[PDB]
Amino acid sequence: QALTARFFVPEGLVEFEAQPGALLIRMETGCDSPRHLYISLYLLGIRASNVSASTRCLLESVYTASAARAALQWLDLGPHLLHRRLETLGCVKTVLLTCVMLMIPKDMYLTWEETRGRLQYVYLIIVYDYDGPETRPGIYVLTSSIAHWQTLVDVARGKFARERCSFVNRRITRPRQIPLCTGVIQKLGWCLADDIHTSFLVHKELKLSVVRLDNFSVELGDFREFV
């Protein structure tokens, strides 16, 4: 059982994208003639602050294209306004591509357990730091054996206390700047404990440290925001 989604994708984003383990996300662009663009999450990696600068240099040297340029511009408009623009569509099956309704970078992947739980749900977590210049959006992908949403939010508050006090510092220092939320929890599905393989990736004659997830069942989740 699979729900098909066929896509007309331009050639300005096909770098690092011919592999199956890719996630296209329909973000609302600032320009109104496409009204949206199907960005990759690896382009959310280069904007992020939690990732390494070496992988950022790799993402710069692999995405010298006007499409990724303008997409970076339209995501760089709204300060922390990404959750009011970003909207996912599911994983790529095969690249003009097909999508269902799995590879991941090593740095943005994280866990808070010893990954010995058999069933493990996967989640996306944005965080909005405000002790930078304006906003450091940290992307995170989390596999965990927890299932109930609210206790995941409580352990996220237990792990992101720096982001919470940075949020309330931004609230008490800049009164005219009204921030919405620290971030967003949203699930994507679940895997077993065995398919997580820390391995390598070579694409466009370029090197990458990857973590692959084989038996990834996909289930779309809502952008459930959290402070």
Next chain:
Amino acid sequence: RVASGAGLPTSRQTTIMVTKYSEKSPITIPFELSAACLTYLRETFEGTI
């Protein structure tokens, strides 16, 4: 496959199909003849004993 108990795991796989490739090993031997041998074999002059 052994018929296991209640909830203990097992394999669903039956009848694996593996392949065996050949191992090539040709052999060679030469043998030589004199041209005198060939001329006395083919050209049989009537002549003597």
Next chain:
Amino acid sequence: GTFCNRLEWVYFLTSGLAAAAHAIKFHDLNKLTTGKMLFHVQVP
């Protein structure tokens, strides 16, 4: 190469382990809860 065609079969009653058993076929174990045998003995 060819298939693993050399498979063979084994039966219960061909094995001598059935000498330790008293094999009984009875088609209602799923409707059976317990099976009891109760013994009476006077002592000398």
Next chain:
Amino acid sequence: EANIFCTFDHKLSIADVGKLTKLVAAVVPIPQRLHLIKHYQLGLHQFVDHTRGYVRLRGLLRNMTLTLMRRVEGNQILLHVPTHGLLYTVLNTGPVTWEKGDALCVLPPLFHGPLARENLLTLGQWELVLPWIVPMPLALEINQRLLIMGLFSLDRSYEEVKAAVQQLQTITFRDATFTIPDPVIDQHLLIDMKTACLSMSMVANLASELTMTYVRKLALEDSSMLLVKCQELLMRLDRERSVGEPRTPARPQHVSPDDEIARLSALFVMLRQLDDLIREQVVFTVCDVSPDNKSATCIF
């Protein structure tokens, strides 16, 4: 994967299988989501602990997996986890009426008052305790009531909180009275109070200046019965704040539509952050209820 086989170390007599065969389509909690499971971790008996915290049982139960009880046959159980979305049937023993239209949640059971303490399964010391299936308004009511119990009772002697909770622990919901057994404070309950105070501080901060004085305007305009009660509450809070006269409001200067949109959207975000403490997500959506209120067909 789906069908989960459990067992028993002890034999069942005819009485045990007789009271088990009336437990078909009852939801039981399983902590593991594994296949060849054992009966001591089945149910809540390994997790139940009096004088330990109801909120701990609540958090672990909402973290536990759920499954449906069908087809015992003698030393076998055949638990089947319900798939997400498909219609199933349920059979509750919790003495609370149901409805064809509402939703459900799963809560650790309270004592009803007759105090039967026999859920029709006991193996030696081991017993079976079933989680109560509760309709959604009673579920959020007991959640908010234990939250008020935890939020109010700090830094108070025992008599004033006793006089509070003799009338606060009781809930009369559709001709049925329930009381909460173990309201004891928790570090987890402390982090709920932490999220509560931060959320109400944030909705205190970024609320509009007109909404801070709106009920004064509606008080000066119109008099209704709920408005009379609201004026009673707000003026009592004002005289507990200040003995001076609360002034009338004039033309508000800072009128800006995008400002109201932004600050009230962040306000709605923060009210979601506060409500998700007590608003539990659903577990069952009723398609049909049996007329004897024993069983139901629920779509999940």
